[PDB]
Write a structure and sequence with these properties.
This is part of a larger assembly, with chains A (1259 residues), B (298 residues) and C (73 residues).
Chain A: E1 3-4, H1 11-17, E2 88-90, H2 116-120, E3 128-133, H3 135-140, H4 142-181, H5 187-221, E4 228-229, H6 232-241, E5 246-249, H7 251-261, H8 264-276, H9 281-298, E6 310-312, E7 330-331, H10 334-353, H11 358-376, H12 406-410, E8 421-422, E9 424-426, E10 437-438, H13 439-445, H14 447-456, H15 463-472, H16 475-484, E11 490-493, E12 503-506, E13 510-511, E14 516-518, H17 520-526, E15 535-538, H18 543-551, E16 560-561, E17 566-567, H19 575-582, E18 597-598, H20 601-610, E19 619-621, E20 653-655, H21 657-665, H22 680-692, H23 695-716, H24 731-750, H25 756-781, H26 787-793, H27 800-807, E21 814-815, E22 819-820, H28 835-870, E23 886-889, E24 913-914, H29 934-943, E25 947-951, H30 964-967, H31 983-992, H32 995-998, H33 1017-1024, E26 1040-1046, E27 1051-1057, E28 1064-1067, E29 1080-1082, H34 1095-1101, H35 1104-1120, H36 1128-1138, E30 1141-1145, E31 1157-1159, H37 1160-1173, E32 1179-1182, H38 1187-1192, H39 1197-1202, H40 1207-1216, E33 1220-1221, H41 1226-1231, H42 1253-1258
Parallel strand pairs in A: 9-14, 10-13, 18-19
Antiparallel strand pairs in A: 1-33, 2-6, 3-4, 3-5, 8-15, 11-12, 11-15, 16-17, 19-20, 21-22, 23-25, 24-25, 26-27, 26-29, 27-28, 30-31, 30-32
Chain B: H1 2-10, H2 18-39, H3 46-81, H4 88-104, H5 114-132, H6 141-161, H7 167-174, H8 178-187, E1 192-193, H9 218-237, H10 240-250, H11 260-266, H12 271-285, H13 292-295
Chain C: H1 4-28, H2 37-40, H3 44-54, H4 68-72
Classes of the chains: A alpha+beta (1259), B mainly alpha (298), C mainly alpha (73).
The complex binds magnesium ion and zinc ion (2 copies).
The structure holds one RNA strand of 5 nucleotides.
Chain lengths: 1259, 298, 73
RNA sequence: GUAGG
């Protein structure tokens, strides 16, 4: 497996594939239920239905294989051969391929210079086309035919003159005879009127025939190839008048002849000529035409494949006609389409053998065209073949496309054996690598291993008896099972699996019941609630799979979340409450027996058991040797006249008993801690432990913390009751005062003194003030010993707004369709809302719920798009070859006389790599290629450095992918990234994970549409697709004088650049709210008005660095609005991916097209090649494009087809003949090969393991 | 869409009356005699042959005149017969086929209009098509008319009685037996698509709910392999000669077993010797010693 | 809101319209004095449509008998 | 189709 080349399939190849030829619509007999002869399912073309059984029965046994019986001709082999072998249908009248036409012009390609309507009215038998003309022959005999037509006109005029003479004679004769007769007064006048009416009619037909002669003559003078003759009567007239110099035809046959006689080389030359000197949209049309023509010219495949001649058929088992119980049947819809095409072809053949009219045969050929097209894709034209009438018919194309297509449901996401699922319950007695599996689940997962073990232990006599015993389920089987499951990892997994912590390995363990048991600490990483959930439990089998689950996917080696390098496996619901209750300042209860001095902790717990002491009370505690003192206690020490090293010996402190216990939980080497732990400080110390200790110790301390936290949370005694939540007493007074004020304003509105809109505006203001005031009063009232304050302050669970609306008035509630009411709710959930208050609360509740469902759909889609563009990048080099870097500000917002580190230094420069060394006082402070943590950054800012040159991926120059040195250190491991890691996929997952969590929207439009910029997730996608912003603000082109022209029709902005450059004029809406002064100096980068900048022009005018920094800043400020933080490397990967391509301009010497997308690498190679050749390099400009366009444009067709849009890409790849090499990830996942990312990489696969000679000597 | 274009293709053509149609038929027979004379191997004058050819061409033109005229009638009949499984437009084409057949077999000798003669052949062609290409599992014509007669008479029974008639009653009105009744009732069903919604708007297909049977169960396959190995082991435990003769008799190396005397050619023994050693082999293998390991296999 | 009666009325109306089309066709292809009420009609459309509504129709749903409250709601 | 996530 080295490539998958694809090209246009000619008729000869289709014949080669065929092992026969279909000649009937028959499938099976109605009474014998066996396949018929020479139709569909025929044994003689596809293969025997039963293993080695020929249809007649001449051969029925297995021994005599590889022979054909002369009775029915069936070849005896395995029935599975039917699944492969294919036949082919013949066509009496050629038809055209639907896919390559009736679409965008990037696949049709304008090969023949005709509008789509022309083809649509030729290849459906509605007009004529002139396939070929003897144009030279027509000019050779021009004088002769001209003379003949002149003679024809001469005799026409002579005959007409004779007709005039006869008419005049008749008129005179009848007039004379009737006036002589005198039958009535004026008979002569009446007959003369009749005669002149007859003359008029004869003249009318005379001019009509003259017209027909002149028009057929000028049409003859208007002969050329590729001319449509809509009027069939006209074409017939041409044919009767003249033949043997022009040939015309209808339907796909004319196109087939035209392509056969086509000369793509001459067309390519002409198109190059017009591209050299051409203007307008004609240049774009000639560009597309050149693109498609070049494709045929470069590739050996001939264009005649556009119009097929034989229709391939599927092997029958891919379209099974399975038998169902009850006498019914079942068939895939492809059978019906094949039957229709076969029937229509047969009837056309029958009608062609007998002399038949042109009308009927043309109609039948049109029907055949309609049928074959449906087979390629039903419903691409007119109305879809409905078949039974309740639904369309699934065609061939429909199986390769969409959510349910073959690509995205059967090559990427497959089903798998050795798996299970069940509800989950929390298990606190486990460790960080243990999970409980029910007996039945474990038994059914490990059945082969249990059977092998049973036979080895002699409980079971044989494999069959072992199977019988395990199915019976006797106690010996369960004992063997309990023996066998251990030291074997199982991968637990949850359904959404947003990020790579979704699948985690555990060591199993038997347990009664039927619900999995899981470790609480890891629950928050999955996002696994226990309301009611379910978790898949996959089982690795091979040695490699279990080894991987041991080393990589273990639940104990995934402390740090890769989004931002912070701990994720230390949840806080019930345990942080216990720890906070432990290390809490006094007043948490009545501090009984405080201030004493105790010999050691042991005496403290004995006193506590005695009940005199309280866990919260400041007392003096000694510590035996080996207890490291507090970090800040290092300077202070005891009082002595001799040197004393309290870093490692006895020392007395003032602290609480609970602080002593908490410190006892932590490792002995860890210094003391004497503050509240809460949620942030606990995360900080966990981060410190994960940084500075091996993994097993970290896990052990996490488990001790879990146990102690649960126990002390139980001891805490937090509750909720009627008296636990008390409304502030001051609420009623203040709210009634504000009600009085509101009533006064309502009264003064009743007199019309104030407008309704204004009244609503001030009510909003006053009630916002009132709700803020009551919130402050409630916050002041509640002590810190109240159960709720404990669980909200500690960081366990809850936010103060929920408390505000539980105990304080809920207040302003948005009305429907993003409006605000003037009368806020004046009650709390404790007090109890009223009816209309409940209704107007529901107004917002339902909208909130709807939003969440929609958000999941949008975030999921975004995450999918992100991965596909970013999949290719992989760290494929240990260290870079270059030195260029990227400048970052180390410390910003530096107050007067001091230096302050930036608030978000953690997500900007931490974990990067310093490319060049730094010297501020003549000495190195941060050595090169050393990461940036708290200590180094603190020292650097203390020295007073303002900016640094951090190495980063954008400037990284690596021949293969991107080196590890530039990428910095990963976040989930806390160490430099190993070679071959998939940084693209983790980047995309990190970007996409919080998309659900964004869940923010403009609270009120404010009555103006288009002013407020898109916010939240839409903004992000609007960022990541290069989409021009909804509210766009033009940017200054360059320095100069800017002024406003307020034309009545529409506002207008005009800036004349300085230095005499050309004046530049931009438009602007009437509602501007501009800020730049009129007739004033402007700078290059400044924006003209409020809105949102368009990335394209910033790239065009400023530079790639400007758009890069603007993009990362914009997305990061969007994200951190709610509070989510991600590192900048994740975004930088994608932002680098966007700009990889380039727009070639002035493609003169490069010889390829101008103004089309080009990979940067191929641009550089072509430029080097052409400058080496002596020709100048074609120019180029950076071009920012969305993630989607970029993914579709990827070189490998197979990966592109696996993306959302399939038909266009497959068609373009087919016409271009692009062989896809299997380098990449999404290309190799479908083939089932090893992804070249990490353990699958080459250098990591070709080692040999040998025991040492001394080891073999040891024995 | 396409049927609209075909009706347009019909467009406006001159309808036929008695005098016009009989004159056309006269030209038809004139041309038929002309081409008959042309086909004769006897030498004919060149100008005479061209005269015969042009009158034959004029007769062909008259033919197409009749067909283009009566397209409207045949599509009317197609409407009468459509909606029963086949496509409407295909029925129209089949009616056109019946029309060309009938006009090939019409003459003015009949003292009536076209509409009474052609319509019989149009009805014939449509009925044949509807009986031949309607059902996926094709039924033959005799059984097809059996099905339709049963269906219509059963509908008449429902209309009259208003209840489901007893099988014997239907058998009597049909005069067949109840066995043939259930047979024909089962023969008249229709396939149900595997791509049906399965009653679910999305994510489901009736084609992904029924398990196959060709697939080899790994459990049974490995059990068979262990059976083969254990039997071969116990077979080797016995004498190599006894082993070989039993193996060739029961065909443990090839699919087809060999007869007794069939073994007495390669091994050069008698048809009764081979029987004797086979018998004592069955006696030994019947011993409980070399049976236990084979008991669970059955 | 269309209640049950209106939906059933709409479906039986569609069935009876199909019946009218069929009987009009038959009348156009039937001889006078061979015409009776019991012969001209055909009961297939009406029963076909009413059964095609009561099965395989979104508004026709499976009763949920978890408890009487499920039934009511 | 409707429930639970
Ligand atoms: Mg949940
Ligand atoms: Zn055979
Ligand atoms: Zn690098």
């Amino acid at each position: 497996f080295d490539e998958l080349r694809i090209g246009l399939a000619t008729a000869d190849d289709i014949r080669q594939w065929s092992h026969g030829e279909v000649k009937k619509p028959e499938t099976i007999n109605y009474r014998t239920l066996k396949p018929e002869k020479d139709g569909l399912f025929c044994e003689k073309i596809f293969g025997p239905t039963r293993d080695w059984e020929c249809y007649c029965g001449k051969y029925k046994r297995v021994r005599f294989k590889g022979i054909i019986c002369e009775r029915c001709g069936v070849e005896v082999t395995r029935a599975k051969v039917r699944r492969e072998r294919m036949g082919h249908i013949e066509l009496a009248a050629p038809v055209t391929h639907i896919w390559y036409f009736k679409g965008v012009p990037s696949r049709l390609g304008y090969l023949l210079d005709l509008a789509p309507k022309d083809l649509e009215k030729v290849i459906y038998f509605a007009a004529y086309m002139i396939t070929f003309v003897d144009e030279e022959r027509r000019t050779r005999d021009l004088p002769s035919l001209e003379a003949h037509v002149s003679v024809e006109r001469q005799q026409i005029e002579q005959r007409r003159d004779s007709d005039l003479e006869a008419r005049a004679k008749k008129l005179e004769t009848d007039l004379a005879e009737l006036e002589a007769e005198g039958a009535k007064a004026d008979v002569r006048r009446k007959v003369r009127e009749g005669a002149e009416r007859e003359m008029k009619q004869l003249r009318d037909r005379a001019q009509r025939e003259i017209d027909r002669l002149d028009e057929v003559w000028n049409r003859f003078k208007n002969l050329k190839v590729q001319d449509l003759e809509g009027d069939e009567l006209l074409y017939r007239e041409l044919r009767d008048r003249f033949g043997t110099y022009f040939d015309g035809s209808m339907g796909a046959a004319a196109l087939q002849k035209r392509l056969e006689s086509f000369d793509l080389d001459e067309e390519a030359e002409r198109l190059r000529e017009i591209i050299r000197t051409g203007k307008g949209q004609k240049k774009t049309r000639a560009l597309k035409r050149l693109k498609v023509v070049s494709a045929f010219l470069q590739t050996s495949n001939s264009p005649k494949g556009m119009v097929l001649d034989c229709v391939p058929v599927i092997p029958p088992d891919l379209r099974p006609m399975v038998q169902l119980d009850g006498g019914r049947f079942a068939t895939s819809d492809l059978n019906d389409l094949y039957r229709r095409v076969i029937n229509r072809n047969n009837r056309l053949k029958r009608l062609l053998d007998l002399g038949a009219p042109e009308i009927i045969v043309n109609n039948e050929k049109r029907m055949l065209q309609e049928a074959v097209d449906a087979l390629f894709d039903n419903g691409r034209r007119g109305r879809p073949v409905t078949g039974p009438g309740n639904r369309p018919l699934k065609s061939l194309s429909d199986m390769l496309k969409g959510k349910q297509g073959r690509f995205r449901q059967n090559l990427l996401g497959k089903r798998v054996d050795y798996s299970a699922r069940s509800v989950i319950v929390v298990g606190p007695q486990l460790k960080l690598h243990q999970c409980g599996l029910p007996k039945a689940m474990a038994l059914e997962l490990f059945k082969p291993f249990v059977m092998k073990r049973l036979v080895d232990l002699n409980h079971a006599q044989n494999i069959k008896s072992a199977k019988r015993m395990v199915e019976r389920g006797r106690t010996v089987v369960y004992d063997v099972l309990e023996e066998v499951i251990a030291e074997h990892p199982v991968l637990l997994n949850r359904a959404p699996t947003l990020h790579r912590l979704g699948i985690q390995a555990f060591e199993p363990q038997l347990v009664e019941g039927k619900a999995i048991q899981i470790h609480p600490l890891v629950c928050t990483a999955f996002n696994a609630d226990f309301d009611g959930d379910q978790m898949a439990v996959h089982l690795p089998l091979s040695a490699e799979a279990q080894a991987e689950a041991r080393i990589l996917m273990l639940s104990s080696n995934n402390i740090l979340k890769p989004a931002d390098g912070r701990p994720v496996t230390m949840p806080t619901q019930d345990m942080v409450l216990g720890l906070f209750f432990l290390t809490t300042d006094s007043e948490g209860r009545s501090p009984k027996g405080e201030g004493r001095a105790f010999g050691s902790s042991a005496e403290a717990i004995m006193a506590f058991d005695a009940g005199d002491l309280t866990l919260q009370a400041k007392i003096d505690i000694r510590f035996p040797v080996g207890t490291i003192p507090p970090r800040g206690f290092e300077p202070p020490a005891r009082e002595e006249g001799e040197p004393e090293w309290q870093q490692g010996d006895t020392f007395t402190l003032k602290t609480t008993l609970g602080r002593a216990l908490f410190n006892e939980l932590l490792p002995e080497d860890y210094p003391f801690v004497d503050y509240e732990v809460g949620k942030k400080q606990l995360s900080e110390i966990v981060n410190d432990l994960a940084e500075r200790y091996p993994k097993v110790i970290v896990a052990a301390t996490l488990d001790n913390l879990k146990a102690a936290g649960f126990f002390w949370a139980t001891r805490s005694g937090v509750t909720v009751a009627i008296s636990d939540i008390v409304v502030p007493d001051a609420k009623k007074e203040i709210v009634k005062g504000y009600e009085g004020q509101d009533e006064k304003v309502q009264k003064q509105y009743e007199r019309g003194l104030i407008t309704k809109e204004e009244r609503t505006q001030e009510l909003i203001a006053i009630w916002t003030k009132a709700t803020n005031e009551v919130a402050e009063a409630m916050n002041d009232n509640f002590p810190k010993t109240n159960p709720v304050s404990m669980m909200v302050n500690s960081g366990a669970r809850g936010n103060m707004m929920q408390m505000r609306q539980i105990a304080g008035m809920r207040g302003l509630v948005s009305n429907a369709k993003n409006e605000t009411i003037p009368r806020p709710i004046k009650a709390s959930f404790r007090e109890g809302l009223s009816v209309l208050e409940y209704f107007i609360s529901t107004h917002g509740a339902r909208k909130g719920l709807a939003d969440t469902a929609l958000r999941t759909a949008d975030s999921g889609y975004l995450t999918r798009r992100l991965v596909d563009v970013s999949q290719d990048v992989i760290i494929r080099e240990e260290d870079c070859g270059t030195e260029r870097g990227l400048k970052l500000p180390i410390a910003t917002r530096d107050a007067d006389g001091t230096l302050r580190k930036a608030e978000d230094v953690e997500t900007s420069v931490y974990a990067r790599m310093l490319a060049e060394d730094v010297v501020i006082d003549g000495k190195v402070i941060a050595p090169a290629n050393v990461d940036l943590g708290d200590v180094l950054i603190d020292a650097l800012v203390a020295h007073g450095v303002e900016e640094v040159k951090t190495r980063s991926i954008l400037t990284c120059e690596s021949q293969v992918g991107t080196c590890a040195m530039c990428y910095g250190r990963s976040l989930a491991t806390g160490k430099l990234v190993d070679i071959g890691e998939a940084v693209g996929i983790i980047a995309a997952q990190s970007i996409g994970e919080p998309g659900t969590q964004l869940t923010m929207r403009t609270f009120h439009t404010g009555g103006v549409a288009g002013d407020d910029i898109t916010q939240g997730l839409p903004r992000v996608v609007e960022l990541f697709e290069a989409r021009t912003p909804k509210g766009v603000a033009p940017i200054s082109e360059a320095s100069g004088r800017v002024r406003i022209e307020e034309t009545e029709k529409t506002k207008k902005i005009v800036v004349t650049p300085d230095d005499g450059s050309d004046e530049t004029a931009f438009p602007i809406s009437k509602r501007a709210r501009l800020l730049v002064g009129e007739g004033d100096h402007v700078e290059v980068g400044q924006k003209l008005t409020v809105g949102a900048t368009n990335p394209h022009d910033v790239l065009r005018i400023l530079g790639q660095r400007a758009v890069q920094v603007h993009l990362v800043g914009e997305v990061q400020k969007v994200y951190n609005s709610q509070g989510v933080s991600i590192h900048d490397k994740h975004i930088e990967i994608i932002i680098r991916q966007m700009l990889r391509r380039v727009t070639i301009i002035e493609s003169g010497d490069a010889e390829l097209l101008p103004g089309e997308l080009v990979e940067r690498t191929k641009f550089e190679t072509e430029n080097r090649r052409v400058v080496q050749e002596g020709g100048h390099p074609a120019s180029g400009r950076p071009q920012l494009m969305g993630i989607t366009k970029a993914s579709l444009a990827t070189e490998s067709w197979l990966s592109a087809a696996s993306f959302q849009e399939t038909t266009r890409v497959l068609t373009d790849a087919a016409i271009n003949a692009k062989s896809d090499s299997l380098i990449g990830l999404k290309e190799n996942v479908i083939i089932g090969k090893l992804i070249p990312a990490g353990t699958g990489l080459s250098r990591y696969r070709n080692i040999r393991v040998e025991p040492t000679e001394e080891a073999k000597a040891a024995m | 869409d396409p049927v609209k274009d075909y009706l347009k293709q019909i467009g406006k053509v001159p309808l036929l009356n008695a005098e016009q149609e009989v004159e056309l038929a006269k030209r038809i027979e004139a041309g038929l005699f002309a081409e008959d004379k042309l086909a004769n191997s006897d030498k004919l004058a060149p100008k005479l042959k061209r005269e015969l050819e042009i009158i034959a061409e004029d007769g062909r033109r008259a033919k197409n005149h009749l067909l283009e005229a009566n397209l409207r009638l045949v599509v009317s009949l197609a409407k009468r017969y459509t909606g029963r499984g086949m496509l409407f437009l295909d029925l129209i084409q089949e009616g056109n086929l019946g029309l060309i057949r009938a006009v090939e077999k019409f003459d003015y000798t009949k003292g009536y209009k076209f509409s009474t003669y052609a319509t019989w052949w149009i009805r014939q062609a449509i009925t044949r098509a509807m009986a031949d290409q309607a059902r996926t599992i094709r039924i033959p014509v005799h059984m097809v008319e059996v099905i339709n007669k049963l269906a219509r008479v059963q509908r008449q029974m429902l209309q009259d009685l208003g209840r489901e008639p007893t099988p014997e009653e239907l058998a009597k009105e049909l005069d067949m037996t109840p066995e043939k009744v259930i047979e024909v009732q089962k023969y008249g069903r229709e396939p149900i698509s595997l791509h049906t919604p399965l009653g679910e708007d999305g994510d489901s297909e009736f084609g992904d709910l029924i398990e196959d049977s060709e697939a080899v169960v790994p459990a049974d396959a490995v059990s068979f392999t262990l059976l083969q190995e254990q039997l071969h082991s116990v077979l080797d435990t016995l004498s190599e000669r006894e082993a070989g003769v039993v193996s060739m008799r029961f065909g443990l190396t090839d699919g087809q077993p060999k007869t007794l005397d069939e073994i007495g050619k390669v091994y050069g023994v008698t048809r009764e010797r081979i029987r004797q050693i086979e018998s004592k082999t069955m006696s030994k293998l019947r011993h409980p010693s070399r049976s236990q390991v084979l008991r669970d296999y059955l | 809101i269309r209640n049950v009666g209106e939906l059933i009325q709409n479906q039986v109306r569609t069935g009876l319209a199909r019946m009218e089309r069929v009987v009009r066709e038959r009348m156009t292809t039937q001889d006078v004095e061979a015409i009776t009420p019991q012969t001209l009609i055909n009961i297939r459309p009406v029963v076909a449509s009413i059964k095609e509504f009561f099965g395989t129709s979104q508004l026709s749903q499976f009763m949920d008998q978890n408890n009487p409250l499920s039934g009511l709601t």
